[PDB]
Ligand binder design. Sequence first.
Ligand SMILES: Nc1ncnc2c1ncn2[C@@H]1O[C@H](COP(=O)(O)OP(=O)(O)OP(=O)(O)O)[C@@H](O)[C@H]1O
Lengths: 55, 505, 85, 473, 239, 120
Amino acid sequence: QGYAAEISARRNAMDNASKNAGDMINRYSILYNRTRQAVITNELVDIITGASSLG
Amino acid sequence: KAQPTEVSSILEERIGVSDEANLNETGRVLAVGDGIARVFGLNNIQAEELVEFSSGVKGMALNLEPGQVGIVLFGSDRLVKEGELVKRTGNIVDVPVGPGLLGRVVDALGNPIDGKGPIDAAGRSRAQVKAPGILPRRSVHEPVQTGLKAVDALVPIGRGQRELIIGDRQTGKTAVALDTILNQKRWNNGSDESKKLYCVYVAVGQKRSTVAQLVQTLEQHDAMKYSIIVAATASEAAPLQYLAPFTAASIGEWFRDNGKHALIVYDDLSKQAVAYRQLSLLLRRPPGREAYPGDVFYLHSRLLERAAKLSEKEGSGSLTALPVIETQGGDVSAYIPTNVISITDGQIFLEAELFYKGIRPAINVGLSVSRVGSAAQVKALKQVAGSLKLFLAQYREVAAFAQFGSDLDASTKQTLVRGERLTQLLKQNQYSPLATEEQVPLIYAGVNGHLDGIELSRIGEFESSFLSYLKSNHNELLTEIREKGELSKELLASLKSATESFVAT
Amino acid sequence: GEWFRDNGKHALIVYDDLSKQAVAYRQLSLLLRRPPGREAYPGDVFYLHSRLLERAAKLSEKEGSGSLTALPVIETQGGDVSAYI
Amino acid sequence: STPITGKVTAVIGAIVDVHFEQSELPAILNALEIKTPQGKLVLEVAQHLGENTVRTIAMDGTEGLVRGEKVLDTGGPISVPVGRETLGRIINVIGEPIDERGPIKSKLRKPIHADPPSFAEQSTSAEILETGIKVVDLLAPYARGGKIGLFGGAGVGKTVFIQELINNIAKAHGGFSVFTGVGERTREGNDLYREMKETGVINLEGESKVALVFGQMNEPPGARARVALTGLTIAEYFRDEEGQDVLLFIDNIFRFTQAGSEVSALLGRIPSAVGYQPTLATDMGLLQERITTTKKGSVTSVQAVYVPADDLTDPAPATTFAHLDATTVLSRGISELGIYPAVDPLDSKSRLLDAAVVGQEHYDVASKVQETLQTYKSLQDIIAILGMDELSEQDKLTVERARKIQRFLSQPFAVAEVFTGIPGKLVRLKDTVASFKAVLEGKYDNIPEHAFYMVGGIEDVVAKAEKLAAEAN
Amino acid sequence: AEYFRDEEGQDVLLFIDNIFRFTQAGSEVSALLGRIPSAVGYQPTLATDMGLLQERITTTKKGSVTSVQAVYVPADDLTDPAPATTFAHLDATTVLSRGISELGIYPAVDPLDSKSRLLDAAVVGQEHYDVASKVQETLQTYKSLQDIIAILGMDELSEQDKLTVERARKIQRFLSQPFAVAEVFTGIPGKLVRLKDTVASFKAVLEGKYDNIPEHAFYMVGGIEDVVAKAEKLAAEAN
Amino acid sequence: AEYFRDEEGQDVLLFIDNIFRFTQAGSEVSALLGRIPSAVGYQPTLATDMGLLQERITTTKKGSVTSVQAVYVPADDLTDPAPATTFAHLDATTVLSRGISELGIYPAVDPLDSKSRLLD
Ligand SMILES: Nc1ncnc2c1ncn2[C@@H]1O[C@H](COP(=O)(O)OP(=O)(O)OP(=O)(O)O)[C@@H](O)[C@H]1O
């Protein structure tokens, strides 16, 4: 009985873990997209600024 | 008929101006590419002066140089050709102001696009007017009854309180200020001007079909007799979209300086920032964070600072502002909104998931707040909603706590049930504003746990049922809430009896 | 390859790679003071490869049904497809 | 009469500079011709640099050019031929027929940079464009003169879907179709044209019901940032001359955005965010607001959207989503179940899915359908795990209902008649509402699930039920 | 301010809001002043103008200037050059996180990242230093365990770690303090809590004398006696 | 090295470090040569200068050059092009890794990415 109770609460805990991991993936994907866009933009700024101070 | 030819021929008589047409301005256009134009001459031009090109397109001379002047266009460059003749108006950029602007739909320059003839303007006013100093102000003390449930419950708005509506795409943002304008029909049908409140909606960079349907809808509910629409749609030039909210702000200042009370709604400042960085990059000016020029904070700053409550020395005018910011995926850490948050007097966050759950309005209470709204809340609502935000934050605490399926005590399960009832309570359909006398008893029922025995699905019919119940029967109490805006103990107990009566069903 | 293709024949070409070729064209355009774009690339670099790869085709029986087939090679960096080239 | 002869002074890739003689300068956005040995080369005045000298961008390859050659000005913008002659012709961005069926003997030619219709000319209430397809007319209804974001990669019958749309508009409303491949793969454009001949929407001798414009990939960005405006002007003619509802099909809007960004890059403008052009909102709004519903008629535009590297905060889909009134998603999983079309029911959403738009009944029907399929999709885990044992009579009813709808969403195609043999059905709106409503009430729960796969309507429900009952007997 | 510091020789409270707006004003004109744009979008003369501003804000032998300056952070990026430059000029940092405010913790001071040139055991007293040391250790332990709490929760902890997380989360709610200024946001009277009582309060919390008291009774409270009072109210009301 | 290969006819070992300082110093001046700054902060003339330096390092039929080049990787980024170009010039790539050094094990070689052309 405690064996089945353990596997029940274990299955519950792994379900909660999958749910929390999905939520945290949903946050860090948005963080990833903002980071990627900011990196490309910020290096393009330096590309332009070098092309800005030409003769 | 021929009366349009009569009016146009009187305008042909004005076309008298040719007898005194010695313009001290005309100069050749050096170059004109990428939404800009360098013009030689104009040696008595003023800074930020309106000029007009030979192809009819006007422009603002923005930067002055020894040798030339760089003038931005107010349209497509397809009309402006090199080497032409550039007459100056003689004026810093001004727009028509006056009462006849009500009902009309204009461009960024007050030129009407409704096709309803000319504009009865009471004057012309500059665009970049100084915001009033700290002395001709007053702290807000008068409510702005938006008609929405959770808005008027949790985030009250003072006359002149600069409150941000922030959200995401297709998240019910526009409908909020729309239904606020529709609530203002109550007093705009009335007679006291200090009770009246005039509405200016500023649609920039949007679809002409969308603006047409909005104007159509405002004519259906007959908000048009107090409405002013400023259209700066996406087909039009970026400087027009840059310029139009300043013009509507001048209109709001015209109403405010007449002692009257007025509401302006910006929708959206996000595209205005896009147009402004489009300008600045075509000005070859260096960008900063997220490719914006660093003055874009100063831009929306100097826009929104021209909206406050005048003191009695100025005639107690007010001008309340509703900016709209479309963010990207619920982000509140992009460079543009964090600037606006540092300007406005509070936030109305719309969570995408709540509207994805169909909860309309999709108000995240935990993010949305006003700073000085409590000083100008309706006094009855201030009486009856003191525990309300506390109880909703309390229910929010046990909201994420109850997802684990664990059973709880009667206290937290009680807060769970009552907060579910309050959550399903505050939904509200579009074009359905609620008066304060209507909003009071729903709050009084929601506080005192009467909704707990009612089914969670039954709440929506229960609302209208109990409202029609009171309007049928306790109409005297509705008039008491209307007249006082404040519940006495006798009104409190009579309200209690009138609730618990229909709570028995 | 188009010589074989217009002989009613069958030609496979393998470009290996195109990433170095894009770097070379980037260098040529940057030293020619053309205005750079994303990751300092020129604007027409897409116009480069689109003008390249469309030269491989499968011809008509009216033409003689020649066939040029292209196998280009893209060296990615860190297993990324979001990079511009 | 007056040849405005210009001289080439600078050729930089696709950028051409022309010095003119005095007081002869054309305005911005005008076609300029150069008689090459290989044809004509077209230029487009975009920047008056002063000194009687302007800057244009190319419309084809700029090889072998000598600076100082005679430049012929057309005065106006790019004239493109319009009219009944244009149906079933393959047209470049220039306006020339490239199907090698001879010249297009159109009567009128129109400039491509026309203005959008005024605010007064906007039809102040978007009705529903009745397409003919059950799922589209049910779940994500299209505005008559609206914007439609089609998602999904190739291989899902997306071309089959859009040809079925062409035939359903041709039968239903009689308006025509204008397809526009901006940056289209030339091999795939050929396969598309060959199929459209074979499926009959192009009749080489009779009435082709569609006009094609293919800006191929090998064309400079000056072409590909104008192919969309060419197809736009062609559709605007059939709206504003014939008073119809004309459907503009655009692939790809994202390649068009790339073209506009590359054009702004080659003009030496400072790039904005993401590497896109700084004129991105304006370059979009010049395309969108010329697509609307007049009082003469409407142009309804369906356009594919590639999501770039699977990001929605990317400003090009974030700009496109500020115009799309309705979305349509061709998932693989729906085509995986052998369902034609491959429409995901859950994702394809409209801003006109509203009771004050489609009426209260259509709204409530679509509401119950979305709720039923949402509950079904939520149950799909324990359906495979535990089975129908955990379903109550509340539940297994709704599970069966959603299976019946999921088969019933499938529609025979008038274009998949050489493919499947089953003729398609122009399924009307009012039949579709009542059909899904009678399924939502449960009046055909006795009918098996198999009697719903690839059917027209509720009359075809009853007919296939009786036929499968007779074949089982 | 420096006039009264020099002419009068008094104690000058200089409140500045917002010092970031100054550097931003230095940024907006610099592109028009012909300068090449520097880092991010700011001006090249950032640290120099910041220095000439800050070095006049000082305490001489003549007078005493106690200055408090708000610092706006652009989009919560502390790696922005303007606040990072500003850190070099300050004696006592105090950092407000939005995420701490999202837990309703007012004020939303980060307990870790605040620093001082003060807080030495031979300055604040040894016991004060020790208590603050143990508080920072406890909260650092909690912030380290935060990710495992996010994935697994408090159940997959060791019991010493679980007790530490419990005590730290009690401490976090105990940090919040009712303001007389923000009374219109709370309806709660402000709490001017003395120093030594605060030290003994955190002492007894680190000693765990109130681990029996639930976490919510620590929230938005004055001294530890007020935690006792609020726990009494929760015991009498929640029952 | 070229002298002791070709003018000598003899096996030559070659030990170059740092090859990254070459491209680095080219980038350090190419901005002040009036070149438009390319990608990552490097010069536009990266692959050409790297090629002309590497292709003069070879084993001819006249003599053998064995090249050992220690290459700097800025902040352990292999997708940095100035390390990433160098992979095209090398037969025996041998990769160190800081995370392996965090185990304290020496030599902290990645057993995976250190490939060979001689691994037949
Ligand atoms: N209370 C409500 N009742 C009915 N519909 C609502 C309500 N609130 C929002 N909606 C729906 O939300 C949709 C979006 O409305 P709205 O335009 O205000 O959102 P938005 O975020 O402002 O979009 P945009 O920014 O594109 O204008 C509308 O289709 C409307 O039907």
